C-alpha cells in the first residue's frame, strides 16, 4: 500500500513537469533568436557587406543547426515521458493482480476452515456414531480432495 501511493505521487509530478519543460523550451528558443538577431545588428560598423555577412551567418547557423537540434532533444524527452508512463501503468497492474491473487486464496482457505471448525464442534457431543458428524467428515473429505486437485 505504500508503494502503490508513491507510484501515483511520482506519476502526477511527471505529468506536470513535462508540461513545465515544454513551456521552457518555447521560452528559451525566442531568447536564442533575440540574442542572435540582436548581436547580428552590430554589422553596421562596416558597410553593406559587413551587414549581410553577419545576417547570413546568423540566419544560417541559428535557423539551420541550433533550432532543429533542440527540437530533436524535445522529441527525445517526449519519447522518454511516454516510456516511463507505460512503466508506471504496468506496475499498477502488477500490484493489483498480486493483491487479487492473495485475497482469493484467503477466501478459499476460509471455505475449509469453516467446515473444520464445524466438525470440531460436532465432535464434542461424545457420540462417534452420530450421523451428523459422519456427514460433516464426508463433506471435509470432498473439500480437501477438491483443494488438492487445484494445487
Amino acid at each position: 500500500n505504500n508503494a502503490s501511493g508513491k507510484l501515483l505521487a511520482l506519476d502526477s509530478q511527471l505529468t506536470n513537469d513535462f508540461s513545465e519543460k515544454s513551456s521552457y523550451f518555447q521560452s528559451q528558443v525566442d531568447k536564442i533568436r533575440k540574442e542572435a538577431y540582436a548581436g547580428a545588428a552590430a554589422g553596421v560598423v562596416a558597410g553593406p557587406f559587413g551587414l549581410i555577412i553577419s545576417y547570413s551567418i546568423a540566419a544560417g547557423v541559428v535557423e539551420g543547426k541550433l533550432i532543429p537540434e533542440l527540437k530533436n532533444k524535445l522529441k527525445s524527452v517526449q519519447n522518454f515521458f511516454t516510456t516511463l508512463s507505460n512503466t508506471v501503468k504496468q506496475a499498477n497492474k502488477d500490484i493489483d493482480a498480486a493483491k487479487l491473487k492473495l485475497t482469493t486464496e484467503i477466501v478459499a482457505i476460509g471455505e475449509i476452515k469453516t467446515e473444520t471448525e464445524t466438525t470440531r464442534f460436532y465432535v464434542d457431543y461424545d457420540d462417534l456414531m452420530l450421523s451428523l458428524l459422519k456427514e460433516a467428515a464426508k463433506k471435509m473429505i470432498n473439500t480437501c480432495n477438491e483443494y488438492q486437485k487445484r494445487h
Binding site: 502503490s4 501511493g5 501515483l8 505521487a9 502526477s12 509530478q13 506536470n16 513551456s23 521552457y24 476460509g110
Partner: protein, 54 residues
C-alpha cells in the same frame, strides 16, 4: 530598450508557483491513496471474519 530580465523573472515566478503546488499536492494525494487501500484491507478482513463465524 528591450526589457528581457523582467520577462525572465516573470516567467520564472509563474513557473515556480506551479512547481511548488504540484510538489505539495502530489504527496498528499499519494497518502490518501495508501489510506484508501489500507481501509479496504481492514474492511475485507472484518467481513471475512464475520462470514467465517456465521
Amino acid at each position: 530598450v528591450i526589457p528581457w530580465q523582467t520577462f525572465d523573472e516573470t516567467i520564472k515566478e509563474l513557473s515556480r508557483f506551479k512547481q511548488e503546488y504540484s510538489q505539495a499536492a502530489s504527496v498528499l494525494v499519494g497518502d490518501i491513496k495508501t489510506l484508501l487501500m489500507d481501509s479496504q484491507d481492514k474492511y475485507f478482513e472484518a467481513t471475512q471474519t464475520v462470514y467465517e463465524w456465521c
